[PDB]
Design an enzyme around this catalytic site. Sequence first.
Site, PDB file in Angstrom:
ATOM      1  N   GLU A  82      47.453  90.197  24.087  1.00  0.00           N
ATOM      2  CA  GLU A  82      47.975  90.837  22.503  1.00  0.00           C
ATOM      3  C   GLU A  82      48.870  92.889  22.734  1.00  0.00           C
ATOM      4  O   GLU A  82      50.207  92.554  22.518  1.00  0.00           O
ATOM      5  CB  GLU A  82      47.065  90.801  21.810  1.00  0.00           C
ATOM      6  CG  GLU A  82      46.742  89.546  21.113  1.00  0.00           C
ATOM      7  CD  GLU A  82      47.347  88.902  20.260  1.00  0.00           C
ATOM      8  OE1 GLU A  82      46.634  87.651  20.238  1.00  0.00           O
ATOM      9  OE2 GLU A  82      48.478  89.236  19.912  1.00  0.00           O
ATOM     10  N   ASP A 122      55.252  90.077  15.623  1.00  0.00           N
ATOM     11  CA  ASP A 122      54.871  88.784  16.436  1.00  0.00           C
ATOM     12  C   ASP A 122      56.339  88.348  17.097  1.00  0.00           C
ATOM     13  O   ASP A 122      57.140  87.939  16.528  1.00  0.00           O
ATOM     14  CB  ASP A 122      53.445  88.170  16.015  1.00  0.00           C
ATOM     15  CG  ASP A 122      53.664  87.644  14.895  1.00  0.00           C
ATOM     16  OD1 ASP A 122      52.957  87.315  14.458  1.00  0.00           O
ATOM     17  OD2 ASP A 122      54.725  86.791  14.625  1.00  0.00           O
ATOM     18  N   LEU A 162      47.309  90.872  12.428  1.00  0.00           N
ATOM     19  CA  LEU A 162      47.924  90.746  11.155  1.00  0.00           C
ATOM     20  C   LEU A 162      47.607  91.396  10.043  1.00  0.00           C
ATOM     21  O   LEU A 162      47.391  91.194   9.770  1.00  0.00           O
ATOM     22  CB  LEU A 162      48.275  88.303  11.681  1.00  0.00           C
ATOM     23  CG  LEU A 162      49.177  89.189  10.438  1.00  0.00           C
ATOM     24  CD1 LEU A 162      51.077  88.270  10.823  1.00  0.00           C
ATOM     25  CD2 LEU A 162      48.829  87.005  10.006  1.00  0.00           C
ATOM     26  N   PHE A 179      40.744  84.070  17.533  1.00  0.00           N
ATOM     27  CA  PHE A 179      42.197  85.830  16.644  1.00  0.00           C
ATOM     28  C   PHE A 179      43.473  84.682  16.877  1.00  0.00           C
ATOM     29  O   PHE A 179      44.082  85.350  15.801  1.00  0.00           O
ATOM     30  CB  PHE A 179      41.528  86.064  18.169  1.00  0.00           C
ATOM     31  CG  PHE A 179      42.135  87.465  18.313  1.00  0.00           C
ATOM     32  CD1 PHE A 179      43.146  87.774  18.516  1.00  0.00           C
ATOM     33  CD2 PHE A 179      41.239  88.727  17.748  1.00  0.00           C
ATOM     34  CE1 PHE A 179      43.794  88.940  18.801  1.00  0.00           C
ATOM     35  CE2 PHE A 179      41.406  89.829  17.850  1.00  0.00           C
ATOM     36  CZ  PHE A 179      42.480  90.383  17.697  1.00  0.00           C
ATOM     37  N   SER A 194      40.517  68.117  21.739  1.00  0.00           N
ATOM     38  CA  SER A 194      40.078  68.758  23.159  1.00  0.00           C
ATOM     39  C   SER A 194      38.652  69.254  23.281  1.00  0.00           C
ATOM     40  O   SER A 194      37.707  70.336  23.816  1.00  0.00           O
ATOM     41  CB  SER A 194      40.811  69.925  22.929  1.00  0.00           C
ATOM     42  OG  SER A 194      42.466  70.102  22.983  1.00  0.00           O
ATOM     43  N   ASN A 200      44.903  67.699  27.823  1.00  0.00           N
ATOM     44  CA  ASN A 200      45.170  67.648  26.190  1.00  0.00           C
ATOM     45  C   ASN A 200      45.511  68.928  24.878  1.00  0.00           C
ATOM     46  O   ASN A 200      46.494  68.526  24.162  1.00  0.00           O
ATOM     47  CB  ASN A 200      43.697  66.647  25.710  1.00  0.00           C
ATOM     48  CG  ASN A 200      43.973  66.740  23.953  1.00  0.00           C
ATOM     49  OD1 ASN A 200      43.875  67.730  22.812  1.00  0.00           O
ATOM     50  ND2 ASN A 200      44.381  65.688  23.883  1.00  0.00           N
TER      51      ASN A 200
END
Length: 162
Positions: free
Chosen positions: A11, A20, A32, A104, A117, A132
Amino acid sequence: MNIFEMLRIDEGLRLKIYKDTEGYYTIGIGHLLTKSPSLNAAKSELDKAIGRNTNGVITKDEAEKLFNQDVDAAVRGILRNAKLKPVYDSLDAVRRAALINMVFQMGETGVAGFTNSLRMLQQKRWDEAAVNMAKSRWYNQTPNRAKRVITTFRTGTWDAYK
Ligand SMILES: [Cl-]
Ligand SMILES: [Cl-]
């Protein structure tokens, strides 16, 4: 390596409000603030998060504090999610960190939509799940990061982060 270091790598760390990859107002280590287009709204959410008049700028310490809270919330979110918890419980420690990373980034919700998945992960069909997972908007939009998380699920090692 651990979840905190891993996410700090994915990040970054910015001490001023920034947009972002989706154009949303964020700050710190991927925290965020708001999906709204308004910087004011963003400054407002920020001050409310920090508990002071920040004026769009925070210290390292404050960023780390938001970070700890966010990681804790992600873990707790997984554990409360009926679709996620079982997957998480089935995994080894490395792969659990991969799963937290995704939550996250995209929310419990976005992750819980990787149904197919998830089942593969649960069955320990690593290569398959990896393939996948790559057929996703997630992978197409943030390919380098997605690759790192995917390799992590595929190998169960931190190599992609070395
Ligand atoms: Cl908050
Ligand atoms: Cl990326």
